[PDB]
Structure 1
Amino acid sequence: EEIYAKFVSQKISKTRWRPLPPGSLQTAETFATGSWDNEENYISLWSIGDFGNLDSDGGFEGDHQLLCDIRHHGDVMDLQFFDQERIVAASSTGCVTVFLHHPNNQTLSVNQQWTTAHYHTGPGSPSYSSAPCTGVVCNNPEIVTVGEDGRINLFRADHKEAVRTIDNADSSTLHAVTFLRTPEILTVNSIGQLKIWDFRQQGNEPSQILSLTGDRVPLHCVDRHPNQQHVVATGGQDGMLSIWDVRQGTMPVSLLKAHEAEMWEVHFHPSNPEHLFTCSEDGSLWHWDASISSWLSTDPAKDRIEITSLLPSRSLSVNTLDVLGPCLVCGTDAEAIYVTRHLFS
């Protein structure tokens, strides 16, 4: 069906759905966003407007209603839900912040904050320099983050300090991070590599490394298939999409062109994961259907992936997406958000 765009008069760097109650029969009712490149950046909670109704006096109540906000510090580099009331966000300040929604009040608050999670160092004094925190992933009650400092941190939603830190896991920027298994993560970098880390190991060095062959394509985003802990998808500086089986050598299994630019997020569908979605600095947003899991076929001219642009035009950059049941949302540099309640009609 048609897609309900909204201007919000801030650039949106990140969007996320509110996690549904286990065993409910609701659609995705609420989403959260984070902003970037303002004089003031914010994190906001929104409801999807109800296009089903008019009352006697003819008003269009079908707007994506703002529930509540809170002001941020720096740019909102990455964003994720932690439970059904708490959210975690990264920052250009190297800060990591946990927030709490108050349904009885319609407000946000801070819940906990790590103001120096990421920082660059220098010769012999604790006059640290700000390092952008680039990505965040949650495994409640646990949390992991990456940054320009090449640091990996492990944090906890009951603890104030770091549970573990790993400085200089790269000499370049680390961009994004995901959990393969609860003590076992994967990160991506400025070189064009996937680095795998096990918090059980007492060294700081990586448990495994994967790459492209020689020429450097920085990898900006990563996801890992919901019912295959060994299948990983990454997005390049060029607009390539790479599918990996982390058990089978050092290279991707499947290599596809997705954009004419930097690909900013990639996601498998949380219930339908033979479906995939991607956004980019080429101004486009795409759906991919492929229904061995079809993502691991070495000949996409035999086995299918059938591919749809969800936007009817190209905008200023699409930084982010999220998809939950039939609902999809994306966020842009055109100071705007796009939402559908239905992706299968």
Structure 2
Amino acid sequence: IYAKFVSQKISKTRWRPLPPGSLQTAETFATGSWDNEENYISLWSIEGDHQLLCDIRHHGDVMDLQFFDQERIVAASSTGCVTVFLHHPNNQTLSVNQQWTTAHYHTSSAPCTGVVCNNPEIVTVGEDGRINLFRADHKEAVRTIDNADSSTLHAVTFLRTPEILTVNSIGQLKIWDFRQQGNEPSQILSLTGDRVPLHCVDRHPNQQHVVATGGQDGMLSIWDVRQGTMPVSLLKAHEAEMWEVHFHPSNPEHLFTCSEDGSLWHWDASSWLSRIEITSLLPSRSLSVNTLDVLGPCLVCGTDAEAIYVTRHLFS
């Protein structure tokens, strides 16, 4: 593993997906920054090293970031705007491809807090309680659900599309479907109480009913949406907020979490619904680790020390 300092607090880091049926490992990743007057979305290509491929100014903090496909990156802004940026296949520059400037708003600006992609669909959530389904090259949302909750939506994942699951500031998981009538969830699960925000969620890659969430209190919870209103497992973990949680996409016996307390943990259960081994990957006294991504043996993460950490050799 190695660090590179980049003069911006990094909110989001994501690997560019590999061409289908590629045998090479990930080598390009995107970053989004926050807490600057001038925030950026940047692309980087790879003692290891990486260099700046191109960048673009982003208005507002980068609240979330996902690749939609190899060339399109979707960003959520603190302004409420959702933007598709295009990385050109031939000239490698970034440009604004399309956007929904009123994805989230108060009727005042409402941050877009989460986005997930399943090409051609894009799903977004925000502090206005709106849940949007967008499709590439459609000017208007395909569907918007106006959630009437007094809580704040913090993150979203697909279950089986067009079914989704959201988590909120009072510790509830809510399930929705964009084909549904009305604005109510189909099911709710939650923590014991209303005092513990959930900040992140990820679905298991092969078991569409299994999700992991991370909380204000640093704990990892595992849920089975077929089973009751409560978690299956509640595991002590970090000393402060868990900001992201990811199942490894090709071997989900591995799972990764990161925290405000400066930690990034590699959990190795090699089932989550039933002795898990944990390794802490970053140095002691790191500032908040805001984000991570993993693909094959490659891990990238970004911190409030204005650092990006990379390894392309997690298992060798």
**Which TM-score bucket, shorter chain as reference?**
over 0.9
Which consecutive residues of structure 2, in runs of 5 or more, have no partner in the other structure? none
More deviation, 266-275/311-320: 311-320
More strand by share: 2
Question: By how many angstroms is 1:150 displaced?
Answer: 1.0
Residues in 2 aligned to 1:311 and 1:112: alpha-carbon distance in whole angstroms:
36
**Does the 8 Å CA contact 2:202/2:211 hold for their aligned counterparts?**
yes
TM-score, length-normalised on structure 1? 0.90
Residues in 2 aligned to 1:14 and 1:344: alpha-carbon distance in whole angstroms:
23
Question: By how many angstroms is 1:64 displaced?
Answer: 1.0
Aligned residues: 316
Secondary structure of 2:159 counterpart: strand
Note the alpha carbon deviations across 1:167-199, whole angstroms, 9 max, x for none. Answer: 234222100001101110000001110000011
**Does the 8 Å CA contact 1:260/1:282 hold for their aligned counterparts?**
yes
Question: By how many angstroms is 1:116 displaced?
Answer: 1.0
Note the alpha carbon deviations across 1:107-161, whole angstroms, 9 max, x for none. Answer: 100110111110011xxxxxxx100000001111111101111111111102010
Question: By how many angstroms is 1:102 displaced?
Answer: 1.4
**Does the 8 Å CA contact 1:238/1:259 hold for their aligned counterparts?**
yes
**Does the 8 Å CA contact 1:152/1:169 hold for their aligned counterparts?**
no
Residues in 2 aligned to 1:140 and 1:327: alpha-carbon distance in whole angstroms:
23
Counterpart of 2:273 (choices 278, 281, 296) is 296
Which consecutive residues of structure 1, in runs of 5 or more, have no partner in the other structure? 49-60, 122-128, 298-303
**Does the 8 Å CA contact 1:15/1:33 hold for their aligned counterparts?**
yes
Note the alpha carbon deviations across 1:286-344, whole angstroms, 9 max, x for none. Answer: 00111xx92111xxxxxx10111001323110000000111100000001100001011
Residues in 1 aligned to 2:98 and 2:150: alpha-carbon distance in whole angstroms:
29
Question: By how many angstroms is 1:214 displaced?
Answer: 2.7
Change (3 A) 1:212 1:101: same
**Does the 8 Å CA contact 1:221/1:234 hold for their aligned counterparts?**
yes
Question: By how many angstroms is 1:205 displaced?
Answer: 0.7
Secondary structure of 2:122 counterpart: strand
Question: By how many angstroms is 1:90 displaced?
Answer: 0.1
**Does the 8 Å CA contact 2:98/2:137 hold for their aligned counterparts?**
no
The aligned residue for residue 52 of structure 1 is none
The aligned residue for residue 45 of structure 2 is 47
Identical pairs, percent? 100
Question: By how many angstroms is 1:63 displaced?
Answer: 3.0
TM-score, length-normalised on structure 2? 0.98
Counterpart of 1:327 (choices 298, 301, 304) is 298
Secondary structure of 2:194 counterpart: coil
Question: By how many angstroms is 1:103 displaced?
Answer: 3.8
Counterpart of 1:114 (choices 100, 108, 114) is 100
RMSD (CA atoms): 1.2
Question: By how many angstroms is 1:62 displaced?
Answer: 5.0
Residues in 2 aligned to 1:20 and 1:144: alpha-carbon distance in whole angstroms:
22
Secondary structure of 2:50 counterpart: coil
Residues in 1 aligned to 2:210 and 2:48: alpha-carbon distance in whole angstroms:
39
**Does the 8 Å CA contact 1:14/1:321 hold for their aligned counterparts?**
yes
Residues in 2 aligned to 1:227 and 1:98: alpha-carbon distance in whole angstroms:
28
**Does the 8 Å CA contact 1:14/1:319 hold for their aligned counterparts?**
yes
**Does the 8 Å CA contact 1:42/1:71 hold for their aligned counterparts?**
yes
Residues in 2 aligned to 1:113 and 1:198: alpha-carbon distance in whole angstroms:
23
Note the alpha carbon deviations across 1:193-236, whole angstroms, 9 max, x for none. Answer: 00000112111110100011235210000000000000000000
More deviation, 149-158/69-78: 149-158
**Does the 8 Å CA contact 1:316/1:334 hold for their aligned counterparts?**
yes
